[PDB]
Ligand binder design. Sequence first.
Ligand SMILES: [Fe+3]
Ligand SMILES: [Fe+3]
Ligand SMILES: [Fe+3]
Lengths: 172, 172, 172, 172, 172, 172
Amino acid sequence: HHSQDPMLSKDIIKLLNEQVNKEMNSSNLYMSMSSWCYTHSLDGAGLFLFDHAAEEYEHAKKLIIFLNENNVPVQLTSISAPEHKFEGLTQIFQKAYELEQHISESINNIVDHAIKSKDHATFNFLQWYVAEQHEEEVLFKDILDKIELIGNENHGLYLADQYVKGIAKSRK
Amino acid sequence: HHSQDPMLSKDIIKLLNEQVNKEMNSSNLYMSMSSWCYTHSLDGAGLFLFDHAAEEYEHAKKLIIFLNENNVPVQLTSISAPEHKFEGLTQIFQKAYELEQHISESINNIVDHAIKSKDHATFNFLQWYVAEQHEEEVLFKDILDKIELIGNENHGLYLADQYVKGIAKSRK
Amino acid sequence: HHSQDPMLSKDIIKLLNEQVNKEMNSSNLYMSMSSWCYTHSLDGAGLFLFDHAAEEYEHAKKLIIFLNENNVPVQLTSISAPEHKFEGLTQIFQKAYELEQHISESINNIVDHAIKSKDHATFNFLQWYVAEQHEEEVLFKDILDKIELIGNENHGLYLADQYVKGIAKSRK
Amino acid sequence: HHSQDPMLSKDIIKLLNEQVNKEMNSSNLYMSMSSWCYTHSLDGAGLFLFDHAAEEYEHAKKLIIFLNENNVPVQLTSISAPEHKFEGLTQIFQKAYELEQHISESINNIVDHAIKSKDHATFNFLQWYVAEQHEEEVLFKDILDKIELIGNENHGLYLADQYVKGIAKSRK
Amino acid sequence: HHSQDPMLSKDIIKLLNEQVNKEMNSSNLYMSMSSWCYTHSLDGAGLFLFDHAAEEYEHAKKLIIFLNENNVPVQLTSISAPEHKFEGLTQIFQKAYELEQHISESINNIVDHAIKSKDHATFNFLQWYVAEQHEEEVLFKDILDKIELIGNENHGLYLADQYVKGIAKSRK
Amino acid sequence: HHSQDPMLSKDIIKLLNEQVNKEMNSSNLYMSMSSWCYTHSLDGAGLFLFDHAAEEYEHAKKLIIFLNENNVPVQLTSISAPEHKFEGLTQIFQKAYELEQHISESINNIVDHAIKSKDHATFNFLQWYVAEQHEEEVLFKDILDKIELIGNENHGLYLADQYVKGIAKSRK
Ligand SMILES: [Fe+3]
Ligand SMILES: [Fe+3]
Ligand SMILES: [Fe+3]
């Protein structure tokens, strides 16, 4: 039996497949960061990072669904082993913010390419992912600002972790 | 600051971390199988395997949560790129059933090691996973039985797919 | 008394008027394909196609609305008689799939042209149309995939027409 | 496979098909009339005529449904480009009123022919259409009467348009 | 303490801050136009323009919120004293329509610069403003059309004002 | 057509017009203060100051409405560019408190003048603005006291910002 060919172009397909893989690699990094937090008495950040990892996995799932609906093969490659050694809460969120910047940029690249290809079906699809990612990027900026404002004198780590715990619970 | 040590023993920790990575590998193989289905007109199987893949990741997450609560560092390894090429619906489900059999034995091995090293907190936490995994294994057996009963003469494939679609929709 | 000039530019105006006429054309072609179906015992496909025709005409209306609100005169041209002879269920849905592909492209062209001329009012207006059209194009791909999976052995036509009836009942 | 032959007679079939084409032609004429009004600061009449154009299209769909149900092929022919230049509001509604009288007459002719041929299934079907068309004819007569009562010295045009706008909102 | 850098580029920041100040200038011109209306017995126009001025300030606030969330300093300049003298209702609405045209182009220019520098978070945030501004521009076109249709012979002004009053009350 | 003259005296008119302008200049200063906060990791104060700016703009709007109702021309002059450089959270609220004192005094001056002119309509109108302003002045005193009580050792800025954030949210 004959199945219709992929409804997207080759280049867009490769970009989307790679984006799936990035979100999965993010999801695992955030779980590793979360574990670091949980095993260094920072369960606030641990919870926050664990839930954020599931958001990133949710993005991968949504990209997959869009691939499936366009009859495009999802070609999953490996998910890299995440970094597991960290210096502290601040460094974790500094790395997290940098990652979220990289992810926003990776989406921009696909969106841009959609515009050049005049693939507006894909452009239109992504816009929801653009908006969501922007809010995530802003969130990590805010958390990082806050961790840095509090500092790590005496009870500062505890205060930071309680602040993040509040965000985790708010965003449920 | 001092954070308490891991509350489980070295050997249990190794088995549990192995199982997390194993569930993640399975999850991605199911995603790949799902995509094959979606790109060969079998959207019922497609959906079924997509939802099943998501549920295997949920198992990995549940193990991670248990690890975190016990102050055990999660050790996420690289997740293997799944097989992308399959011969047809029957062979996907034979390979899936065989995988679920292996996952059931993996879990049995951890539970056995818990009994033997007298870790009943772990024994007890795992029971819920034993029961859920057993239902998943039976389900794959039943799907395979049905695929084999229908055959692929004439519109056997369509019928098999619609049947699988019904299962997927009833489980949501 | 003086009425404000058209709020869109000449090129955009022409492309939008041409799209109005094309949607009217496509509506009539789907009506004709629907009638073929109904007069050859395929009332599932006849309903589906009738309701789709109605929806093409709704797209026409929405374009007209946008033209009116911008003080742009609507220039309806002749609608040519649609094709009325067809070879069968598969060939109708093959043709309709190709028409949907062509419509998706005709819209991508308008959108590109909006971007190009910085008419973002019109870009923003079209995005709902891009989204809807994508879902229609996807739907015809899925219906054509299912018809080809089922085939026209024995009661294949019946099964395929009943599947399409299911779709039609579901979309209402 | 054998599909049952048309349930209606040749003559009725031709008259119903030519009525479908007339209603589609009317719909487009009404759209063109609406556009003239919207582009000459007469949005009351613009709305009114657009909505009336949609209703004429619904009449065409209902005739098509009847044909499909009787296993009669629908034969859509060319729909001619409507007139797009008009002299003013009064002329538009004079021309519309004349068209509605012609529409009423063409329906009367089909009903007469059903009686002659003792097609009472058709006669019975047409009754709802006779009733609705008479309501539409009266409506156009009433709007024309009001347009002629108001005049176009001096803010006559505005008052007429506001009155028509009131009707459009009331009927929807 | 270190606070993260502005998340947007220099050129976008300049365009956005320019737009904030531009919306504030417009807002005050609308307030001034409103007052002229209120002091020349045109309280319908008065209300309409007051509410519209308040809504332009809301646009400035929405831009500011976006700037704040991106860690971009808001640069508020002096806001120009508006024109206080006008010739009449028609000339107020001609000048208002011309302003809305300019505001629509200003926004188009920012959106275009976002596409070009691949800032889609900004592109995406702005779309909502494009759509709202388009509706505002159409509204001013429609009001001007109506003012021009009614004229100012006899109680044309009263009628125009009452019409505008109706619009203002329906939009609250 | 003849419009009634202003129902207020010249001196009161000039005072009220100036008060409109002061509240607008306040609104923009508070937004500048708010931006400073938001770009120095103080989003609590940023939110609080942003919302307070909208309260000040609301006062300007209410003064405007009273002018309009008395047939008094609103003669808007420029809104000065606000200060944008600040040393810290304490200095911001020290400047804010001083401003609120100046604003309370400016209202007293108009109220006083109303008493001397025996303009009791205006005296009565303002009393609501007197009460509101007094509560605002007390608020800034309280916030300033609190910021000064907390200090800016280690985590003091964070604690102050969280305290203010609590007020912002309370007052919504
Ligand atoms: Fe399983
Ligand atoms: Fe009148
Ligand atoms: Fe505007």
